[PDB]
């Protein structure tokens with residue numbers, strides 16, 4: 001049968017506005033290998049995204065790393081969007097980061 | 105630390121397929137195959153070992169002969185084997201030293217057949233389809249003999265020229281970097297404290313939330329995740345009652361630090377102070 005992907009989003013360095021960084025999305029434990037992965041900025045697809053070569057784990061489930069270099073600011077929200085035969089609809093996992101105290 | 109080759113072949117329909125081949129040192133990729141131009145590509149300078157270009161030209165042509173022949177072979181007997189389109193065949197083969205060696209094949213993401221000393225054995229749960237596939241795979245003994253010497257002679261010899269050549273790379277120590285943030289899914293009246301640790305190599309690492317000297321056993325360590333530069337990432341999260349987040353710190357131990365642990369405190373805007 002088929003195996004639905006696990007999706008995990010992380011940055012390479014602590015988030016700091018106006019400083020270059022890397023957004024990663026690690027997608028793993030899925031089968032079959034046909035998969036569609038996008039990195040989003042403000043809900044719009046980012047165009048320069050690299051990914052590692054497809055590989056598989058001991059249990060034969062596949063995994064991939066998608067990543068792009070980026071500079072965050074205080075407006076922008078980032079996410080990873082995946083689609084797979086096991087999914088009714090594309091699943092979206094956000095990059096969680098702190099924005100600081102709301103109250104001045 | 106086990107060097108191995110992986111083979112991914114995806115049969116979408118009777119006349120459309122995808123093919124991927126790569127070589128690996130444990131977690132670390134070292135080689136790739138290019139379907140265009142049929143070239144073995146070396147991801148690192150030390151990926152070649154002490155081996156000569158005249159020997160790589162032969163490996164490539166053996167890889168290509170087998171890679172291409174494995175294609176139309178699967179395509180011809182796909183009905184006599186009850187293979188249904190679409191379907192994927194995965195193979196992993198390699199060796200481990202101090203001594204072992206392996207070659208395993210999966211169909212549709214499950215154990216199907218494997219290579220034991222001199223021939224292909226079907227996995228007994230895989231059923232009669234796998235028994236028939238071993239029949240085709242074992243039709244020529246000389247080919248099976250050549251598969252034996254690759255695992256028994258050629259593979260351990262390559263691990264020679266590889267681990268020695270790449271010692272400076274696999275024995276480096278890259279110090280980690282850490283930071284703290286609020287986790288997204290706390291229960292009511294509670295907080296989730298997140299300690300991120302990135303940029304470290306090699307892989308083994310230690311991270312715990314602490315109250316001074318006392319390890320907080322609620323610390324939940326996630327998966328170690330890769331980066332394109334070869335280093336690893338990890339999050340360790342702790343859920344706490346909202347006021348009870350005083351005096352908490354995150355502590356990281358890693359071989360590269362020489363005893364100088366990283367200690368970060370849940371403080372400042374995080375708390376937040378006055």
Ligand SMILES: CCCCCCCCCCCCC/C=C/[C@H](O)[C@H](COP(=O)(O)OCC[N+](C)(C)C)NC(=O)CCCCCCCCCCCCCCCCCCCCCCC
Pocket residue numbers: 109110111125126127135136137144163169170171173174175176177178195196197198207209240241244247251254255258259262
């Ligand atoms: C791992 C890649 C393997 C990928 C292919 C394996 C898939 C097999 C299943 C598909 C076949 C299904 C269909 C079957 C087709 C038959 O099998 C044909 C037909 O036979 P025939 O030619 O018609 O006979 C007739 C003779 N007349 C002329 C006299 C008539 N036979 C073959 O030739 C093909 C043989 C296929 C099995 C070969 C197993 C390979 C073992 C690898 C060991 C990997 C560890 C080594 C590590 C050391 C290298 C380290 C450095 C390298 C770095 C490199 C980094 C990139």
